[PDB]
Structure formats: C-alpha cells, structure tokens
Amino acid sequence: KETAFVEVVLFESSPSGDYTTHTTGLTGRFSRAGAMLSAEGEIVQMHPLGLCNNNDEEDLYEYGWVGVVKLEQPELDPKPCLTVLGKAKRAVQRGATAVIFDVSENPEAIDQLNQGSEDPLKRPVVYVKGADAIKLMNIVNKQKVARARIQHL
Amino acid sequence: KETAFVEVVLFESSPSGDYTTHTTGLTGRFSRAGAMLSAEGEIVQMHPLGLCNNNDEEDLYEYGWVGVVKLEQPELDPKPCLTVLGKAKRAVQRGATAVIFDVSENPEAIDQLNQGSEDPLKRPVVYVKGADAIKLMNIVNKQKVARARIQHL
Amino acid sequence: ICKGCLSCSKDNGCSRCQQKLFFFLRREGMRQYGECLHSCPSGYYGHRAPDMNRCARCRIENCDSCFSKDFCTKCKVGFYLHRGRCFDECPDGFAPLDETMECVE
Amino acid sequence: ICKGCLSCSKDNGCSRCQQKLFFFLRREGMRQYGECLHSCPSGYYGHRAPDMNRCARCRIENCDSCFSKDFCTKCKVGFYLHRGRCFDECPDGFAPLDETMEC
Ligand SMILES: [Cl-]
C-alpha cells in the first residue's frame, strides 16, 4: 500500500576498531500480508524450498534476520509445501524480522500475498521487482555480509 | 524533537528452530544530535567511561548494534573525555546503528544533546527517562541478549 | 551446468531435482542455493520426504553417514563407531580398531 | 558497598575507580560495568590514561601480562615469551626452558 525504502548497507571493520559503510538504495512495496513497519537486520537469503514446515528440524538462524527470497517461475514447483504467505510465516517464525521476496519471476505472489490482510503477521513483508530487484540480488550474490534497512515513510 | 517508540524484545529459540518472543514497549524522544529515523539491532550496553576515543584501541563489536548508555550523576564523571554527543559519535563509529541514553540521573545531558555545536550524526540518538528508562534497564541488567526496535512515526 | 535439476538458476542454483536425486540446501554466508545430489555430504542422508526427495541431517553427533536420522553408518574421520553412535575413545570394556575404526569386546 | 570504588551504580558497576586500583570494563553478554582491581586480569595491564588508570589490552596476542602496550612480561599458560613477543612453540634459533617457558 505504501512504498518501502530499502537501504542495503555494506560495511567493513576497519583495523582502527571503527567501521566504514557503503549504502545502496532500492524501493519495493509493503504487502498487507504484513505489518506496515520499518525494520532492519543482517540479510539472509532463503531458497523458497527451504521454507517448508515439512522439515522436522532445520538449520538455526540468529534472531533478527531480514530474509531475502527469490521467488521462482510459477511452473517450476508444481505444488509447494506452503503458499508464499505460508512461507513468510515460516521466516518470521524462524526469527525473520522481515521478509523481502524478489517477485520478478512471479507477480501473482502479490495477489496471494495481499490476500491475508485479515490475519497480518507481526512483522513487515515486502516485495521488489525489476531493476530494484536485480540490485538486491547483485549484493546478496557477491558479498559476504550486508545489513538491510527497510523504512515505512 | 519527536517521540521515539522503542520495543525491547526478548527471544528464545525452541529446538525445532522456531522463535518465541517477549516484547516490552517504552517511549523516548529523538534527539537533534541524531537523524530522525527508525532502526533496530541487538542491544549493547556501554559504560560511559567506555566511550572515549582516547585509548589506543578497544574491543570490536559486530556491526549494527543499538547502544544503550546509562549516564550517572555528573559529579561521578566530573570531567568527561568527550561530550555525550561525542560519545554518541564514538558508538556510531564503532558500528552502532543507533544510540539510546538513559539520562534519568542527568537531564543536563538532555539539554546538551538537542543544541548540538557538533554536526548531527546520520543515525538516531534517542534518550529516555523515568519508568521508560527504568523498564529498559531492568531488561538490559538481567538478561543476556535482547533486540531493540526504535520507530519514527 | 547446474547439475541434476529439472529446474535451475543463477540466483537459487538448482531447484526441484531430477528423477530420484536428493535436494540439498547449501549455505555460504547470506547466500543459499539448491543442489540436486547423488550422495549427500558429511552429516546428511538421502531422505524420501513429503515435498520431494531431499537431504537431511544425520542426527548422531560427529557422524558422516546414516541410513536413518538416528543411526550412524560411517562415523567421521578421527572417530570410532559403536552401536549407532560415534566416539573419540571407545567406551569402558571396549577396544579400538584403527583399521576399521570399529569397536570391540 | 562496591569494591575499590569512589562511585557506584546498579547499572554501570564501579565508576571512576579509586586511583590506587585499576579500572576494568568487564563484559557479560550485552552488559558492561566497571570493576576495580588490585591488578589487571589475563591480557591486560595497568596504565595511566589521561582521565584515569585503567586496565588495557596487551597489543601482543596470547600474552598474559604487560609492562607496555607492545612489550610483554609473561605469556599465558602453554606459551613462550621473549623480547616482547610470545609464540606457541619456541621458535627455531633457540631452545625452550619449560621451567621458565622461555625461548
Ligand atoms: Cl542486528
């Protein structure tokens, strides 16, 4: 409903003890699947298939991570463990402080994301697409660590 | 200037990797020593005699933390290494994504902060007092880890 | 050449594995991708799941291979196998075979 | 109430150590409070900062006690100190003296 302002911060622990940082910028939108709140955290990508309730025991992640999830072309998983919605819930349940789907491959997620506005999650859910989506994955793909900063103006 | 809405958040992970959370809410004000932004991170208490640029070097902190700094009666730190503003700049530097001052036993600090002779940091500098302060410290004092979430509205 | 997958990509690696192959989430730093595996790496085993054939953790501490979550079949390098579990030093009344890394009487 | 201390606090432990002793920021999770010691702990050393006399980290790794940021009197248990440095297993050129754990 409102535009989400994503700042992707790259940092380096300088030897002086201090930290230097390189901010990148993007925009996406808040899904009504989730709260209209700002958030921030160490970015973690998740494979969409990593987000199944199916697994009895999974990997642990430190609490507070900003998930990042590249959705796939609809026709490449015939039936998922869960719906996009469902998966955000997993994320949040697994300690996600927010979730950011790169929606480029599949828009319908959007209509499926905003479909559960009745029972919204504690925490923001956001999508991105297009060049804004590409930049995200360029950082997520080539860098070691990056902190995400989502603001609700 | 503005009111700053802080959620301190305790968290535990069940052995499936799922996270349950306890969230305490407080209130404070954004300072004009710091930008007017929301921000969230793991909390790190800093003794105020721990924020001097003086020493050759200090211990390193993982980037993006939220500094929480209980000031003491000024007589108990009569000639301070830098200004409270100055100690805010020193935490950002060392990676803080935001700073929170319990100025309860030193409102003079309140007044120093808002009329900055020193240019304003590009991260939030919030301050608290009374119950809000008290609340914050009860958590910080008695727990091992907590995430903060400061929110501008 | 993302290998062993029906579906695939630069951003998620492999996906929805081919045939009977086993799906395995690898992680390096933030990044995470799919792999359509033949014989899962140390700590994991081919498990036949609801979603798909996927690779799972071998419960037993210090273990390299399982046939099931809770029984180790090849212990890891350094360690001795005994009754499902994995040991650094074989338990009281038991003696080592450095050859088989097994454990005896 | 507090040991070695002029001023005190629930939240910040010792503040402004009595000058005779040394000031040690100690860390427990997210907590950091002043402690006021006889003598600094493993890896720190007495030092007179402008504002006060505070334990500080020996620049030298593994080295239990200092006289200077970079010169190191003793190396921690299972280690060998000479000419300021400290090495795991006494380096070629000399011979260990495990009674003095020298090199
Ligand atoms: Cl964090």
Numbering used by the authors:
A (entry chain C), B (entry chain A): 53 to 205
C (entry chain D): 39 to 143
D (entry chain B): 39 to 141
Give me lines lifted from the publication on this model.
By using a combination of heavy atom and molecular-replacement-based phasing strategies, we determined multiple crystal structures for Xenopus (x) Rspo2Fu1–Fu2 (highest resolution 2.2 Å), xZNRF3ecto, zebrafish (z) ZNRF3ecto and mouse (m) ZNRF3ecto, (highest resolutions 2.4, 1.6 and 2.0 Å, respectively), plus complexes comprising xZNRF3ecto–xRspo2Fu1–Fu2, mZNRF3ecto–mRspo2Fu1–Fu2, mZNRF3ecto–xRspo2Fu1–Fu2 and xRNF4F3ecto–xRspo2Fu1–Fu2 (at 2.1, 2.8, 2.4 and 2.7 Å, respectively). The crystal structures of the ZNRF3ecto–Rspo2Fu1–Fu2 and RNF43ecto–Rspo2Fu1–Fu2 complexes revealed a 1:1 interaction between Fu1 of the Rspo2Fu1–Fu2 and a single ZNRF3ecto or RNF43ecto chain. The first, extensive, area of interaction involves hydrophobic interactions interspersed with hydrophilic (complementarily charged) patches contributed by the first two β-hairpins of the Rspo Fu1 and the region immediately carboxy-terminal to the β3 strand of ZNRF3ecto. The Met-finger at the tip of the second β-hairpin of Fu1 nestles into a pocket formed between the β3 strand and the αC–β7 loop of the ZNRF3ecto, which is lined with hydrophobic residues (I95, I191, V192, A198). The acidic region of the β3–β4 loop (immediately adjacent to C104 of the disulphide bridge) becomes more ordered in the ligand-bound ZNRF3ecto structures, probably as a result of electrostatic interactions with a positively charged patch on Rspo Fu1. For all ZNRF3ecto–Rspo2Fu1–Fu2 complex structures we determined (from five different combinations of species and crystal forms), the dimer found in most of the unliganded ZNRF3ecto crystal structures reoccurs. The overall assembly thus comprises a 2:2 complex of ZNRF3ecto–Rspo2Fu1–Fu2. The 2:2 complex resembles a crab with the ZNRF3ecto dimer forming the body from which the two Rspo2Fu1–Fu2 ligands diverge, without interacting with each other, as the pincers. Notably, the β1–β2 hairpin shows less conformational variation in the liganded ZNRF3ecto dimer structures, always maintaining a tight embrace, consistent with the Rspo2Fu1–Fu2 interactions contributing an indirect stabilizing effect on the dimer via the β3–β4 loop. For the ligand–receptor mode, our data define a generic architecture for the interaction between the Rspo ligands, and the ZNRF3 and RNF43 transmembrane E3 ubiquitin ligases that is conserved across evolution from fish to human.
Rspo (R-spondin, also roof plate-specific spondin) proteins are evolutionarily conserved from fish to humans and have well-documented roles in a broad range of developmental and physiological processes resulting from enhancement of canonical and non-canonical Wnt signalling. ZNRF3/RNF43 specifically targets these Wnt receptors for ubiquitination and turnover, hence reducing Wnt signalling responses. Direct extracellular interaction with Rspo proteins inhibits ZNRF3/RNF43 activity. Here we report a molecular level analysis of the ZNRF3/RNF43 ectodomain structure and its interactions with Rspo proteins.
